[PDB]
Amino acid sequence: PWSQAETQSAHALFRKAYQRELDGLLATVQAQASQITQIDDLWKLHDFLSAKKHEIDGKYDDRQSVIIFVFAQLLKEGLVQAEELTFLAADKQSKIKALARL
Amino acid sequence: PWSQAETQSAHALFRKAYQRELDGLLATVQAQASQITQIDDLWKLHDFLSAKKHEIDGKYDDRQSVIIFVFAQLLKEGLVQAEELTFLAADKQSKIKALARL
């Protein structure tokens, strides 16, 4: 079903993708912040933060039975690339790449 | 008993204080958003932004039951100067200052 080395590297690229979305999030927040003029910009920021937080909290399900779909989402948002999925079994990669288009 | 002038000028002052708080809030946010290094300080900010927003929404209440307390507060937080209250009756000024000194 799931090789060990598979599971390991999976959790790895998982948390790496996490760190990536974190970097992007931080960059965007700092950017928006340093370039505000109106007060409405600040509330745009606020809304952005609530949304992104909500998203991220429920996004990164680490459980095995869902990891494929999580990976799929991450790929659909380009947080990872197909080239980074080579450490998996073939059926898994094809699965992910299929679930991506949904 | 609130005369027309007292109410009108009270609203003008309320708005003045509102814009002032907007400026201060803007300054603080714009500041600590440049002092971020870690990621958790991004959430503090958020929480701050999520707290201070709920405040400002329901802070400036012009109803008779609290208006004096609102002015007292706005006086403590330096959102209004004492000399801006001179349009009010003397008793009200006294009361506001009294609630503000504590």
Experimental method: X-ray
Distance CA B82, CA B97 (A): 8
Of the residues B25, B26, B32, B37, the best mutation for testing chain A's interface (the one with the most A CB atoms within 10 Å of its CB) is B26
Among candidate residues B17, B5, B61, B29, the one with its CA nearest the CA of residue A29: B29
CA B52: distance to chain centroid? 11
| Chain A residue numbers touching B44 (CB-CB < 8 A) | none
Distance CA B61, CA B68 (A): 10
Q: Coil, helix or strand for A94?
A: helix
DSSP B34: T
The token duo for A51 is 């949304």
- Check CB contact of B12 with chain A, cutoff 8 Å: no
Looking at chain A, which residue has its C-alpha nearest residue B20?
A39
What DSSP letter does each residue of A7-53 carry, written as one string? HHHHHHHHHHHHHHHHHHHHHHHHHHHHT--SSHHHHHHHHHHHHHH
The token duo for B15 is 């708005």
Distance CA B33, CA B16 (A): 26
SS (H, E, C) B32-77: HCCCCCCCHHHHHHHHHHHHHHHHHHHHCCCCCCCHHHHHHHHHHC
The burial class, CB within 10 Å (0-12 / 13-18 / 19+), for B24 is middle
Q: Give me the amino acid identity at A7.
A: T
Cβ–Cβ < 8 Å for B9, B85: no
How many contacts does A have with B, using Cβ atoms within 8 A?
Answer: 41
Distance from CA of A17 to the nearest CA of B (A): 15
Cβ–Cβ < 8 Å for B102, B73: no
Distance from CA of B5 to the nearest CA of A (A): 29
Distance from CA of A2 to the nearest CA of B (A): 33
Distance from CA of B13 to the nearest CA of A (A): 19
- Check CB contact of A42 with chain B, cutoff 8 Å: yes
Vertex A79 angle, CA A74 and A84, to 5°: 85
Cβ–Cβ < 8 Å for A16, A51: no
The residue with tokens 């928006």 is: A32
Kindly state the greatest CA–CA separation across chain B. Answer: 53
Domain count, chain B: 1
The residue with tokens 């209004």 is: B80
Nearest by CB to A33, from B22, B29, B50: name it. Answer: B29
The token duo for A31 is 């950017």
Q: Residue B72's domain spans which residues?
A: 1-102
The token duo for B3 is 């005369």
Cβ–Cβ < 8 Å for B45, B29: yes
Distance CA B4, CA B11 (A): 11
The residue with tokens 């707290």 is: B51
Distance CA A24, CA A18 (A): 10
Q: Coil, helix or strand for A20?
A: helix
* Count of alpha carbons within 13 angstroms of residue A92, beta-carbon side: 20
Nearest by CB to B33, from A25, A34, A43: name it. Answer: A34
Is the torsion defined by CA of A27, A31, A33, A34 positive or negative? Answer: positive
Chain breaks in chain B (C to N over 2.5 A) after: none
